[PDB]
User: Fold Heme oxygenase from Corynebacterium diphtheriae.
Amino acid sequence: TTATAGLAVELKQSTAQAHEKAEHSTFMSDLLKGRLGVAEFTRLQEQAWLFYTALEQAVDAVRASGFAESLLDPALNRAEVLARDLDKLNGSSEWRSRITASPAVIDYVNRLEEIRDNVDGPALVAHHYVRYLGDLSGGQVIARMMQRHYGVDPEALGFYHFEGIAKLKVYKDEYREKLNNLELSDEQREHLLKEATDAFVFNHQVFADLGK
Ligand code: HEM
Ligand SMILES: OC[C@H]1O[C@@](CO)(O[C@H]2O[C@H](CO)[C@@H](O)[C@H](O)[C@H]2O)[C@@H](O)[C@@H]1O
Assistant:
C-alpha cells in the first residue's frame, strides 16, 4: 500500500484484502451463483435497510457539520428506495414490525450511531466509501444476478439503480477525485483508513450471520 498516489488509491489498496473477504463470503457467493433465492436476498435487504438507515443519519450529521460536503451527495441515499423495494419483495409493509437486527447488524449500527453522535467526519467518509462505491460497483452485478437467477422484478431492485445519477463510471471517478481533495491530517487519514477496513469487517459478518 502506498500513500503517494492519493487517498483514493490508498483506500483501495489498504482495504483490498478485506474487500476480498466480504465479496467471497459463503452467503454472497451462494446468492450470486444461484444457490439461494429471493427469500435470502430479501433477508439481506432487510438487514441492509437497518444499517443504511443508521449510515444515512450519520451522513446527515457529518454533511451538516460541513465536512466532505460535496462527497456526501444526497442523491446516494438508499433508505427510502430500499423500503419501497422491501414493500414489493414482501408484499406489504409487514416487514417493518417483523425484522430484527442480527448480531452483526447490531454492532454495525452501533458504530454508525457512534459516528453520528461524535460527528466523526473521517470515520463517516470511510463507511460512505465502502457502502456506496460498493453499490455502484459489485452492486450492479448483484442486481443482474437477482434478475437472472431468481427472476426478481427490476422494480424491486431500485436500491441498485441510483435514480438521479446519469453516468456511473464518471460519477465514481469524480467521487475518487473528491476523496483525493479532502483536507485530512495524518491522524484523520490514519483513522479513515482503519475505519474503512472495519466497515468491510462489519459487512463480512453481516453475510456470515445471514448464512447462519
Ligand atoms: C458488502 C460487500 C461489498 C462491499 C462493501 C464492496 C465494496 C466495494 C468498493 C468500496 C469498491 C470500490 C473500489 C475502489 O475503486 O476504490 C468496490 C469495487 C468492486 N467490487 Fe466490491 N463490494 C462488495 C461486494 C462485491 C461483490 C459481491 C462483488 C462481485 C460481484 C464485487 C465486485 C467488485 C468489483 C468488480 C469492483 C470493481 C469496480 C467495478 O467493476 O464496478 N464486490 N467494491
Ligand atoms: O476490483 C475490486 C477489488 O478487488 C480486489 C481485491 O479485493 O482486487 C481483485 O480483483 C480485481 C478485479 O476486480 C483484480 O484485478 C485484482 O488483481 C484482484 O486482487 C481489490 O484490489 C480491488 O479494489
